[PDB]
UniProtKB/Swiss-Prot annotation, chain C:
GO terms for cellular component: chloroplast; nucleus. Residues 12-17 are annotated as: Required for ssDNA binding. It comes from the Eukaryota. Keywords: Activator, Chloroplast, DNA-binding, Nucleus, Plant defense, Plastid, Transcription, Transcription regulation, Transit peptide. Single-stranded DNA-binding protein that acts as a transcriptional activator of the pathogenesis-related gene PR-10a. Upon elicitation, binds a 30bp promoter sequence known as elicitor element response (ERE) and is required for PR-10a expression. It comes from Solanum tuberosum. GO terms for biological process: defense response to fungus; positive regulation of DNA-templated transcription. The chain holds residues 89 to 273 of 274 of the full protein. Coiled coil: none annotated. This is Single-stranded DNA-binding protein WHY1, chloroplastic. A motif (Nuclear localization signal) lies at residues 90-103.
Amino acid sequence: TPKVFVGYSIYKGKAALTVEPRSPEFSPLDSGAFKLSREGMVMLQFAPAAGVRQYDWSRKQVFSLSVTEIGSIISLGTKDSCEFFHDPNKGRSDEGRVRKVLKVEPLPDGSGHFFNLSVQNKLINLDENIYIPVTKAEFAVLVSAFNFVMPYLLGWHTAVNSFKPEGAELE
Amino acid sequence: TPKVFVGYSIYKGKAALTVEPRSPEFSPLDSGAFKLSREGMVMLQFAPAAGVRQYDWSRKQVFSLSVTEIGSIISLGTKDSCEFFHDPNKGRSDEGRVRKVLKVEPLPDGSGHFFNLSVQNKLINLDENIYIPVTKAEFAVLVSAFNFVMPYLLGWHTAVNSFKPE
Amino acid sequence: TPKVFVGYSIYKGKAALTVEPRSPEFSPLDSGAFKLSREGMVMLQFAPAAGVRQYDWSRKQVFSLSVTEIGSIISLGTKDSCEFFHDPNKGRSDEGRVRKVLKVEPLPDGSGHFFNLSVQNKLINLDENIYIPVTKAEFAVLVSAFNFVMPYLLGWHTAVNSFKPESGAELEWNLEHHHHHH
Amino acid sequence: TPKVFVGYSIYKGKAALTVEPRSPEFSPLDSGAFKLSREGMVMLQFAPAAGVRQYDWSRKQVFSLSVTEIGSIISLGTKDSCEFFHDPNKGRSDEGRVRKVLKVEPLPDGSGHFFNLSVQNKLINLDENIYIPVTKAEFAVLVSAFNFVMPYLLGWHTAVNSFKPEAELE
């Protein structure tokens, strides 16, 4: 506190994209210490274009980026690509029924990358696909922000903040 | 904490340039919650060199760098260029002739880049152009400074300060 | 501001790898200030797989990386390699008999690097080896995290914290300015 | 808790090098506000080896690095070089008599860079030189530390700390 809601947004012709960090989670140990129990992540929210300058957020779709997936974006070269597959029932007998795939490839010309989100839900025959292009400059804001936030998503800031004034085994 | 006026300055033959960050804007919400309403930015100030290599900040021109524009600067290569156009009259009011254009291009000798600002407005028949060279070493100080300030202009620091036990 | 234990983990087919930062040490003086007496480091822990996504931490092998060694990791190119050798007192009047060797080299496919830890003890007959591939993506996470902790491991965060409000080569000559004029 | 002395050292064959940040200066304003009056810097200290595993810090040479000079180091490629000249009498009567020159150039096998500090004082016939190799690894530690300390040497941290919830000028 005071809790603040933030998020970088890229608004384009066919769609809009919002990016926001989500807190990691901790669990109690002895002596009043804590353990990082769940890594934080970055949440992406895609929305299709509505009626000029506005978007239909009621038709939005979300996709998360874990620390490792953020590693793929920050190490993505000018003409490289990466794909992420999310299925809540992987391995389960009913896998492949509801899933999301995020693909990041370079634009034809070479002025940036496409962020293409595919959502499938066989239970209701849904098969949405939203894509938005992000310029090299906009990609750079993302890389700077991801680099800043990753240590916090791993909770390393809580660990080093105790590295204040107030090799151990025969290997 | 108190108020501190920082600002990295570059002083050259025909002009000087000062760089300062500018705070994001927040909007009050419900139960002790806040929401960022306006991103922060970096303010660039250009001043013509008067005499004895001093500068008349009386006729200084300023240019605002939004977060996305800052991204253009930090991902700019050795031989790359970028240009920013700012027109107060986006097209809602009138066409508008009052315009500001910032240009960043590699120097001839390839020792860095140069920053060039164009200001013009029909209202007072103004037509200025302040140019200033930035060495590779000074460019690196900007990149480093811009990379650090970036998440703060977005307000992500206020968010991560809550990423802790409890 | 309670004590918190963290650590980035990479889970693979044959082994798992956890990476964790370790605090520097300080030693008091007299002027009401402190002095950095030992740099922090990053501890790597390797564990062999004992089941699907299950690892035996009872047979874990540990390897500490100093700030300089962390320097070799973050500056590694796609086709570069580096080797680290640890032994309780290299030379000395008694080297010992046990050693640890960590190798980091590119994968055949070129999709990343592998981390290989070798542990040899002649005081028994123990000769362990643990291998683990690290994708390009996972390596970037280590690079980002390592770049972040370096300053804290050097203690520069406590120094820089006093850089709050209350260039003439005049600090390079011990103030012995009587030699700057005749 | 308050002041603490840090510093990254590099111990080599016939010389050692200690790097350390130095705080910037602020000045009060009648408005009750402060203004950065002087940028912080990074201090380098070269010491020759006093034997084998020893270094005589009695005869150590200090060289200051401004934020712009730090900028030259962090943007130094694996084949580029940089050089800095410091004269305590610059702008005055007899400049060009006393100086310190720091040169940073790539090692032959392209495995790092060497820092070469030259100390000259013609008035007393002084002419010293201290050479030290810095591996690609140790150099990366410097770049990482330098990129971290930079915004603080500029005072930008005291600025962003007040960016709490509690084209414009164009």
